[PDB]
Amino acid sequence: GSKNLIGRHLRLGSVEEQPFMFFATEGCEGNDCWSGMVNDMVVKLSEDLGFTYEYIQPDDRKFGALNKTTNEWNGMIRDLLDDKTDMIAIDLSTNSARKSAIDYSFPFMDAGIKAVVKGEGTTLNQVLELLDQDKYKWGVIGSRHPETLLKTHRDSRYSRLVDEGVELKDLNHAIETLRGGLFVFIDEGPVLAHNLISDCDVFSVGEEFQSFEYAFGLPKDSPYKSLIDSHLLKFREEGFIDILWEKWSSGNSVC
C-alpha cells in the first residue's frame, strides 16, 4: 500500500533466452550487457516507476524446478526464494509447482508446449508415439517449465517421456542436439518459433498443447506486485508488448 518503487534498487533474476534476453559475455559492463524484449520492458518500468536495477543470473543457469527428493528449488526460482533477487524478469512460464512457492505478475504473453523434430523418413504425429519406437531420441531441458508440465501431467505417459528422454542442459545444448538429427525437442512455442526460424529441416510434431502464460516472478508478499501488475497491464493495453515482440522476434525465413 504505502511502499512504492521510487529510489529502490531492484535485483532482477534473468538469463539469456532469445529473443526475450540477450546477454553479452564481453565488451560491456552491468546492465549494458543485456538487451531484448524483456530488457526493453524493464527499462520502461524503471523510467516510469523510479527504480534502479541490476540483473543477477543463477549460478546453475536454470530457470527452476522443484526437486521431489529434496523438496528444494533451483534456478531463478531458488534465487528469488533466497532473497538474492526481487523479481524474475524473463519469459517465466506459469505453472502450479512454481505458484505454490512464488507469485506471478500480470502476464504478458500466451504460450504453449511445442514439439519439433529433425529427421528424414517416417515421422511422428504426437509426442507419446516416441514411447513405442526407437528411431528418434528426444528430450526436454532439465529444471525448466516443459519438463515440469510433462512430469505433473495427469497422464503419466508424459512422465515416461521425461524419464526416458535425454536430459538437456540448456537451450543451446537442446538446439545443438536437435540439429544433430533424429531427435524430438519438446519446449515452448515462442522460443522455438524465434530460434528455429532458419532451420528448414525442422518440422512440427503435432499441434501445440497445454495453455500457459509468460509473466514475471515475484516473491509472495512483495510490496511491488500491485505496481508491476498495473504497469504490465498498461503495456499490454497500449500495444507495447506487441510492438516489442515485432521488434525482437525473428521475421521471414530462408525456408
Residue 242 sits in the site that holds its own copies (CB under 8 A): yes
Residue 185 sits in the site that holds its own copies (CB under 8 A): no
Residue 211 sits in the site that holds its own copies (CB under 8 A): yes
C-alpha cell at 103: 507469485
Tally of CA atoms within 13 A in the half-sphere of 125 that contains its CB: 0
Name the pairing type of β-strands 87-93 and 202-204. Answer: unpaired
Residue 190 sits in the site that holds its own copies (CB under 8 A): no
In this structure, is the dihedral angle defined by the CA atoms of residues 83, 85, 86 and 92, taken in order, positive or negative? negative
The correct pick among 159, 206, 213, 223 for binding its own copies (CB under 8 A) is 213
Residue 237 sits in the site that holds its own copies (CB under 8 A): yes
Nearer to its own copies, 85 or 95 (CB): 95
Nearer to its own copies, 26 or 221 (CB): 221
Contact 103, 29 (CB under 8 A): no
Stretch binding its own copies (CB under 8 A), from 17-25, 60-68, 132-140, 204-212: 204-212
Question: Which of Mg ion, its own copies, none does 205 bind, CB closer than 5 to 8 A by kind?
Answer: none
The correct pick among 71, 122, 154, 254 for binding its own copies (CB under 8 A) is 154
Q: Give the span between the Cα atoms of 100 and 93, in whole angstroms.
A: 14
Residues within window 39-68 making contact with its own copies, judged by CB under 8 A: none
Nearer to Mg ion, 104 or 224 (CB): 104
**Residue 29 identity (one-letter amino acid):** E
Burial class (CB in 10 A: 0-12, 13-18, 19+), 137: middle
Nearer to its own copies, 58 or 190 (CB): 190
C-alpha cell at 104: 506471478
Q: Give the span between the Cα atoms of 105 and 161, in whole angstroms.
A: 31
Q: Give the span between the Cα atoms of 171 and 17, in whole angstroms.
A: 8
Nearer to its own copies, 16 or 229 (CB): 229
Residue 230 sits in the site that holds its own copies (CB under 8 A): yes
Residue 122 sits in the site that holds its own copies (CB under 8 A): no
Residues within window 65-104 making contact with its own copies, judged by CB under 8 A: 94-96, 99-100, 103-104
Asked if the peptide bond before residue 19 counts as cis, ω within 30 degrees of 0, the response is yes
- Which residues are CB-contacts of 118 (< 8 A; sequence separation ≥ 6)? 178, 179, 180, 181, 182, 183, 199, 201, 202, 203
Residue 247 sits in the site that holds its own copies (CB under 8 A): no
CB of 55 to its own copies, least distance (A): 26
CB of 217 to its own copies, least distance (A): 13
Tally of CA atoms within 13 A in the half-sphere of 77 that contains its CB: 24
Q: Residues interacting with its own copies, by CB under 8 A? A: 1, 94-96, 99-100, 103-104, 106-107, 110, 149, 152, 154, 210-213, 220-221, 226, 229-230, 233-234, 236-239, 241-242
